[PDB]
Chain A
Amino acid sequence: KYRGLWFPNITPPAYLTGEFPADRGFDPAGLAADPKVYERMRIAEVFNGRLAMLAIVGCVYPELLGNGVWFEVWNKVDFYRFALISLQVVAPLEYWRGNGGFGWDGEEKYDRSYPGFDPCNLTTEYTKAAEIKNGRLAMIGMFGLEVQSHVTAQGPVANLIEHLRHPLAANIGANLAHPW
Chain B
Amino acid sequence: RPLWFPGGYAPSWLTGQHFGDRGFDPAGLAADPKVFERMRVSEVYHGRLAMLAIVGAVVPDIQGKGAWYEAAQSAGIGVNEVAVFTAAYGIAEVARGLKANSDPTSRYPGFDPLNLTTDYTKEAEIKNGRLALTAMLGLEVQRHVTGVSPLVNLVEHVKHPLGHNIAESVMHQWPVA
Contact = CB atoms under 8 A, between A and B. Distances in A.
A75 B170 CA distance: 18
Contacts of B84: none
Contact of A85 (B6, B7, B26, B171): B171
A21 to B, nearest CB: 21
B9 to A, nearest CB: 4
A81 B7 contact: no
B25 to A, nearest CB: 10
Contacts of A115: 6-7
A84 to B, nearest CB: 10
A107 B171 contact: no
Given A102-B26, A103-B26, A116 B171 contact: no
B172 to A, nearest CB: 9
Interface of B is mostly: loop
A112 to B, nearest CB: 11
Interface string A100-135: 011100011010000111100000000000000000
Contacts of A82: 171
Given A102-B26, A103-B26, A116 B170 contact: no
B171 A77 contact: yes
B9 A101 contact: yes
Given A102-B26, A103-B26, A85 B170 contact: yes
B171 A108 contact: no
Interface string B165-177: 0000011000000
A102 B11 CA distance: 12
Contact of A116 (B7, B26, B162): B7
Nearest to A110: B7
Interface in B21-76: 26
Nearest to A108: B9
A165 B6 CA distance: 49
B29 to A, nearest CB: 13
Contacts of A102: 26
A115 B170 CA distance: 30
A81 B26 contact: no
Contacts of A77: 171
Nearest to A119: B6
B23 to A, nearest CB: 10
B6 A116 contact: yes
Contacts of B9: 101, 107-108, 110
Given A102-B26, A103-B26, A117 B171 contact: no
Interface of B: 6-7, 9, 26, 162, 170-171
22 contacts: A67-B162, A77-B171, A78-B171, A81-B171, A82-B171, A85-B170, A85-B171, A101-B7, A101-B9, A102-B26, A103-B26, A107-B9, A108-B7, A108-B9, A110-B7, A110-B9, A115-B6, A115-B7, A116-B6, A116-B7, A117-B6, A118-B6
State the 8 A-B residue pairs at the shortest beta-carbon distance, nearest first: A108-B9, A116-B6, A102-B26, A110-B7, A116-B7, A117-B6, A85-B170, A81-B171
